[PDB]
Amino acid sequence: PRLSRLEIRNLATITQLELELGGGFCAFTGETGAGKSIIVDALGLLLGGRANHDLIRSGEKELLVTGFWDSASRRLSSAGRGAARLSGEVVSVRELQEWAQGRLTIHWQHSAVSLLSPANQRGLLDRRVTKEAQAYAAAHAAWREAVSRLERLQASQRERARQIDLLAFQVQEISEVSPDPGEEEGLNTELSRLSNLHPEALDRVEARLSALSKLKNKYGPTLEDVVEFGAQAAEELAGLEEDERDAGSLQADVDALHAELLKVGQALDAAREREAEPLVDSLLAVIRELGMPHARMEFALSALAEPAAYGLSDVLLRFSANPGEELGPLSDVASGGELSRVMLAVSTVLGADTPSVVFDEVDAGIGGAAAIAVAEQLSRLADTRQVLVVTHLAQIAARAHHHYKVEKQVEDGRTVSHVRLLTGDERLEEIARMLSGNTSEAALEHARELLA
Length: 452
Hints:
By secondary structure, this protein is an alpha/beta fold. Helices cover 52% and strands 17% of the residues. Strand 10, helix 9 (369-384) and strand 11 (386-390) form a beta-alpha-beta unit. ATP binds at residues 30-37.
């Protein structure tokens, strides 16, 4: 679960590069821009994201970046197609992203899809109150069950409604008349009597007979078949009614579960509000030291409508570098260098999620004791997992167990970059050079005292 080898072809100032790199703390010095191109832009390409053609070699047709830990690759073509690869063949970019975000971490705006988005932001806090979080997850799942069951009631609703109105209509039509078999046969006789004789009951008799005739034509034919059909209608209607009522009860129950999920969400919110104070104070104590003092930081929860996926409360993080910033979004507002450092602190104090992480543009706006604190932190983390960084500062470049130098060799008839490992005395020489100028007994001495 770590990086091992890196092959880059026709990228910017690079005319094919094969680097067998170990782990631990790897520092890149010399040509800092070239290093940024190697570690941020290229590794950036493997993690996915936008793919600007400017990254492509000056006078070349297409570039390629292969990494070996499983061997992922990314090829960009000025033609317009290019291709992404995982371990074997042509795979999807979305899948490249999903896979590599599990292996690589580049810190910067691209850090958003690492430690910075809503799910991992919430996770930092949610792994301090697992009980409440699982309680929410459970309530939400059961509620989703309820909603699933609850929807077939619409399918039933649309048709069963009209059908039921029909049934009831028929049943009432029959009920009002209240037909009875073996009635017309005598009715006809009585009619024979009344008409043959030849006034009050006559029209009542005729009316009843005609009624039996209509109701006979309706759901008949048989006088019995009518009442039969009425019974069938009664039954069906009863059943459908059972369905509906049942659905209703289930619905009320669902609302109850809703109330429950609400309560749980509230409890979780309280848990957060409780675990907020001790959390932030543990970071500032280490962040205000790595330069940037008087920094303010807090967590703010939003009252979002509904239950949602994680919770009815959104987890937001507010931060301010200066006493006049007024706080605000961690990234996407008041960002730059401080973010990478914050990422570092958070990392060491909490832990590393990916095999190899990289911090970009961190060693800026700072210097001195602070710089040494950041470097030392890079060490602390170096033990756990592999860390990459392009530095120009001396203590930082020295503290890195491994040290890669980025120089520039000219290959006819072009000028190219060229990186190499530092054997020992060479390393000391170059790092001393970094501190102060060139080679000097004082520089060598101080360097040896620092690297110790």
